[PDB]
């Protein structure tokens, strides 16, 4: 059970991830999206923890947690982070590490606080040694994800300042497993004129389902292990850019869609494999209000080093999302020709997905799959 303060920050993080998604969805350079709301909110908590004055005040405003004390934000986000750690093998790996220049030293109090509240590690690298800098970052994320995330980025954009790197691996464990041999090769339609071959897993069972004939989209709910969380997939009827769906994706509309669902025989076919997405949230967080933290001339990150040396150059959000057949073994579904003519949820074109905690309703994941890999 979450404390009422951590529960309020859970809805604060979910709202922040929504705006992050919409902001990145407008970016024609962004393809797949993968955001963990508690990890995003943790980035603003680190800027507030290691900053003062407007630099720390803006980070709290982007989180919309102005009516809460600073130590309430760190403690609340700290409880939220540890709540997800207590629900692993679904398999969930997380690493957070700050990278600063060699000319700068980290203040001991900030190292103690960031490690206690956000599990944040600290490292110094020579950004001008581009090869050694990337290797130090990529090898740390690969070690954190046990090779599932072999590399974060191929280029460091600003050779002065701080890089906040988050490396994550998530593997949904279904409450009802897929058959490990129910996989074959299918064509995934990135567009109507672009088809890439992928592996697809198929299961037919009883799922919460709603067909929106008005706005032309499908919604299915896939419960995770022991129904402690759920994976919701939204897919338009036609092969089209998700921009039309993203204008309907709101907190209010999602609830309306959840209430119209009903348990029906549904044949679910999803791409199978590991999706690797790396985001640089730094410029998008600035567009939400985190302006001073990224300005090399105005940033106040003095709590990080003691004498105002650093500025937020990058906030790396790197995730490896594995779709797999593994799940819980379910007893017979023998009292259920129910699955003889099931509704087809044939996900061979881009879709929006999110992971919701069943107990609190807090957003564990939000993203989309527009271009898989095979």
């Amino acid at each position: 059970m979450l404390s009422p303060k951590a529960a309020t920050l859970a809805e604060r993080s979910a709202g922040l991830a929504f705006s992050l998604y919409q902001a990145m969805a407008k970016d024609q350079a962004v393809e797949n999206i993968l955001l963990s709301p508690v990890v995003v909110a943790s980035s603003l908590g680190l800027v507030s923890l290691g900053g003062k004055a407007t630099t720390a005040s803006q980070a709290k405003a982007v989180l919309s947690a102005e009516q809460l004390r600073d130590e309430e934000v760190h403690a609340g986000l700290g409880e939220l982070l540890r709540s997800l750690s207590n629900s692993t093998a679904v398999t969930w790996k997380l690493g957070s590490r700050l990278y600063g220049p060699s000319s700068v030293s980290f203040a001991e109090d900030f190292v103690r606080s960031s490690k206690q509240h956000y599990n944040c590690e600290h490292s110094k690298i020579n950004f001008r040694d581009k090869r050694s800098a990337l290797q130090s970052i990529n090898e740390w994320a690969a070690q954190t994800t046990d090779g599932k995330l072999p590399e974060v980025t191929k280029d460091v954009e600003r050779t002065d300042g701080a890089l906040l790197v988050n490396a994550m691996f998530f593997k949904p464990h279904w409450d009802e497993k897929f058959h490990h041999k129910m996989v074959d090769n299918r064509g995934f339609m990135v567009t109507r004129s672009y088809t890439v071959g992928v592996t697809m897993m198929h299961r037919t069972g009883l799922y919460n389902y709603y067909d929106d004939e008005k706005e032309k989209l499908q919604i299915v709910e896939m419960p995770l292990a022991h129904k402690l969380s759920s994976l919701i997939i939204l897919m338009p009827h036609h092969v089209e850019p998700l921009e039309r769906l993203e204008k309907l994706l709101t907190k209010e509309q999602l609830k309306i869609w959840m209430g119209k669902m009903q348990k029906k025989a549904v044949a679910i076919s999803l791409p199978k494999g590991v999706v690797e997405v790396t985001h640089d949230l730094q410029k998008h967080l600035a567009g939400l209000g985190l302006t001073e933290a990224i300005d090399k001339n105005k940033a106040d990150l003095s709590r990080m080093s003691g004498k105002k040396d650093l500025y937020l150059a990058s906030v790396f959000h790197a995730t490896a999302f594995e779709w797999d057949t593994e799940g819980n073994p379910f007893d017979q579904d023998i009292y259920g020709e129910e699955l003889r003519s099931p509704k087809l949820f044939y996900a061979d074109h881009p879709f929006i997905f999110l992971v919701r905690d069943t107990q609190s309703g807090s957003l564990l994941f939000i993203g989309r799959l527009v271009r898989p890999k095979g």
Binding site: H179, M182, D184, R186, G187, R192, M200, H202, T204, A267, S269, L339, L344, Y346, D348
Partner: peptide, 20 residues
Amino acid sequence: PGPPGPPGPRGLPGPPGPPG
């Protein structure tokens, strides 16, 4: 005892419309 097969592939895309 073997589970039922997966759903078949998608059908062919429709023919182009008439010339306007």
